[PDB]
Amino acid sequence: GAMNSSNYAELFNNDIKLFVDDTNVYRVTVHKTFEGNVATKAINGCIFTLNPKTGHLFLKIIHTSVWAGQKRLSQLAKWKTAEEVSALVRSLPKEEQPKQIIVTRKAMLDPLEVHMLDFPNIAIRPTELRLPFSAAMSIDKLSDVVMKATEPQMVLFNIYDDWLDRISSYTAFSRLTLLLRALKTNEESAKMILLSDPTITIKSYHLWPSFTDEQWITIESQMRDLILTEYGRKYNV
């Protein structure tokens, strides 16, 4: 059943699994019209599909076009998300298909389960964890590739950059969720912390700066200090 605090280290075993976050599939801006009513304007989206073992990110970019002529968009977004996951599983060799797909929002259980009926041995699981994958669009390179796109389009990254060369998936994942929690809580702050030292840069096939072990310990503590600051400042504690 549900991924929680108990069954956490299963993310890191040798069973192939993908996380799916659908929170940035359907994005809009809200504006006042000429007559003074409200309207939305859809913008480019993305499905977030992650293998937490390898760090392999299957970012399906969702072009505004897909919404044209459709009702119940927020509901459609979940079925579109499930179709795109299904297509990605079908395109992979049998030995690479995942045994589990963990969705971050219970509302994706039914769409995905219906779309994966051809994969009876692939369990669709929810999670009880409050995972910060919605902050994915606060990563400059991911936002840029999403907002620049002019058609549907699949983009590949390793969201752990090359860290697995030096640390384990468990640690890599913790660094990731810590970085995303910071980004989610206070984007401006988190990004200031990450880019202050202009001499540490971002390799072209990477998403985060090329920090040293010593420099990651600095950053991780500053992100934690930043998460705590914004908490006590928001519950006046």
Add this chain to the structure above:
Amino acid sequence: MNTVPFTSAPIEVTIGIDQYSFNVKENQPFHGIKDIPIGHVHVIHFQHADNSSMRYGYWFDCRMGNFYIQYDPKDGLYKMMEERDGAKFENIVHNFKERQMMVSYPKIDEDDTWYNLTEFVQMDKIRKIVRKDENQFSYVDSSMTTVQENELSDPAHSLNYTVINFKSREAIRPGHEMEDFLDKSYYLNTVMLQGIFKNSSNYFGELQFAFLNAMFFGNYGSSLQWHAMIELICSSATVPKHMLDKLDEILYYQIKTLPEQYSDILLNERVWNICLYSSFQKNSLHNTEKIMENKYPELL
């Protein structure tokens, strides 16, 4: 007016016939039921005064043969049997009536309850669900699992109900995943009505049979199958205007017949809130909404 005589009542037992029931004391001189309306299927059922696991019964139509009940002290239960000898049968029946050892099927003449709960239930469809084609009658109890319950063990003692699954290839046309799951019209109209049942009367017959097996035996599977056949219709945008009209009738008499105190084990909160208030058919089961809101307001 037909008869199901009894050889004796060895053991204390509460006997049921259709929606009626009476207590028979151990070795009270009881010798059966007379005046059973010809033209409908019936069900005789037993719960012994000792344990309440033993809730067992037989579906029968006396237009198929001469049935009697004899207690078998090895298997330890009231068994239905068929007398092939017309002469010996009519002879024992007349004897017991003259003696006056038979209770009368107690039918108030304005009362159409049984007819309304069995209108589309035909023995032959029953014998295809309780496979045992060496009897004209059909045995059912509290425990018997469904074929769908075996998949999610003993295949001879199964209820072979039609398999309904809203998350199956049968219910979902590839490329229509969203469309078919939110609006089950395909799964109902093409696949089930036209595909498997043939007409709305066989569907309604199953739905009806499922309910009675649920209510008379507290059979969990039959109840799952009842709720599923309802949900399928309620979850379709496109239903024959006659089917909607008939279902509202069928469900009215089912909710009406239900003992007040078993509401909490026989009714699925979720399916009913969906049917009456969420689904396409919220505005289409007027008689069902009225008796549900007046008899079981707590469940909505």
